[PDB]
From a paper:
Galectins (Gals) are a family of animal lectins that bind β-galactose-containing glycoconjugates, and their carbohydrate recognition domain (CRD) has a conservative amino acid sequence. To date, 16 mammalian galectins have been discovered, and [name] ([name]; also termed p53-induced gene 1 product), belonging to prototype galectins, is a multifunctional effector by productive pairing with distinct glycoconjugates and protein counter-receptors in the cytoplasm and nucleus, as well as on the cell surface. [name] participates in diverse processes, such as controlling apoptosis, cell migration and cell adhesion. [name] was crystallized in complex with glycerol under two different conditions.
The two refined structures, structure 1 (homodimeric [name] binds two glycerol molecules) and structure 2 (homodimeric [name] binds three glycerol molecules), were crystallized using two different conditions, one at a relatively low concentration of PEG3350 (12%) and the other at a higher concentration (20%). As with all other galectins, structures 1 and 2 adopt the typical “jelly-roll” fold formed by sandwiching two anti-parallel β-sheets that consist of six (S1-S5) and five (F1–F5) β-strands and a short α-helix connecting strands S2 and F5 at 1.8 Å and 2.0 Å resolution, respectively. Our [name] in complex glycerols as dimers in the P212121 space group is the same as previously reported for [name]. The positions of residues His 50, Asn 52, Arg 54, Val 61, Asn 63, Trp 70 and Glu 73 coordinate with glycerol. In our crystal structure, the C and O atoms of glycerol occupy similar positions as the C4, C5, C6 and O4, O5, and O6 atoms of galactose in the lactose-bound structure. It indicates that glycerol is a small ligand of [name]. Discrepancies between structure 1 and structure 2 in monomer A are due to the absence or presence of GOL C. B-factors of structure 1 suggests that the N-terminal regions are very flexible, while the N-terminal region of structure 2 is relatively stable due to the binding of GOL C. Just like [name] structure 1 in the crystallization condition (20% PEG 3350, 0.2M magnesium chloride, 0.1M HEPES, pH7.5), no electron density of glycerol was found in GOL C sites, but glycerol electron density was found in GOL C sites in structure 2 of [name] under another crystallization condition (0.1M HEPES, pH7.5, 12% PEG 3350).
Author numbering:
A (entry chain B), B (entry chain A): 2 to 136
The structure:
């Protein structure tokens, strides 16, 4: 494992930016995450932390600012399964991020940090990442 | 076998809206269309008319305002084939519609009508639809 994926967003992201993540959850995965970060330094603020937790069957959403985590939000269940492929859309809108899993909107995360600060996508944890694409 | 597919959008669509269309272009297909319409009336204004033409090997984009069509825009060649499945994203931003076809950004259509007018997605013509989803 032990390596996160990083993708720069040269144009930043605006309402209408779509991140498509395709991958599969390894059969003994505990957790993985997708972070929208505001810069390339290791403590940088996270506009969005999307963290499916399959050892506890839940999906946590949060933000991180000046080094401290915000309040956890969480969706209905976990739309991921060990050993199973997935396709996630993270869609930037004017008032938040829409997290789509499969064929259904899973959660709407209202913006906590300004959208214009987001500068990179990071994908880490127990996941087999097939493809990260920005549209 | 096939039918005009309508998705009603009573709250409209906002920037950061993804229309995902999956289907088959059947073996003898001439052309098909995805319309973002402003109402349910016959001949409603169209914010976007997306029109792959298999018979002429072009993809046409246009609008229909106040009864008459605008000037057509064309994408580069035809990324559709008779007898092949496809995935199209139509992504609404503040300034236009982004068309993605099978992992490749394909064309950008600047708004000609205010996005707020859109009330209905219609998919018709020579296509065998798998799914239409609006996120």
């Amino acid at each position: 494992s032990n390596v996160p994926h990083k993708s720069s967003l040269p144009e930043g992201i605006r309402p209408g930016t779509v991140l498509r993540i395709r991958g599969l959850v390894p059969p003994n995965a505990s957790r993985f995450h997708v972070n929208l970060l505001c810069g390339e330094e290791q403590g940088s603020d996270a506009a969005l932390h999307f963290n499916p937790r399959l050892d506890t069957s839940e999906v946590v959403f949060n933000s991180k600012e000046q080094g401290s985590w915000g309040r956890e939000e969480r969706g209905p269940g976990v739309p991921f399964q060990r050993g199973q492929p997935f396709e996630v859309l993270i869609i930037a809108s004017d008032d938040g991020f829409k997290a789509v899993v499969g064929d259904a909107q899973y959660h709407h995360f209202r913006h906590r940090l300004p959208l214009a600060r987001v500068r990179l996508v990071e994908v880490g944890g127990d996941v087999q990442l097939d493809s990260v694409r920005i549209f």
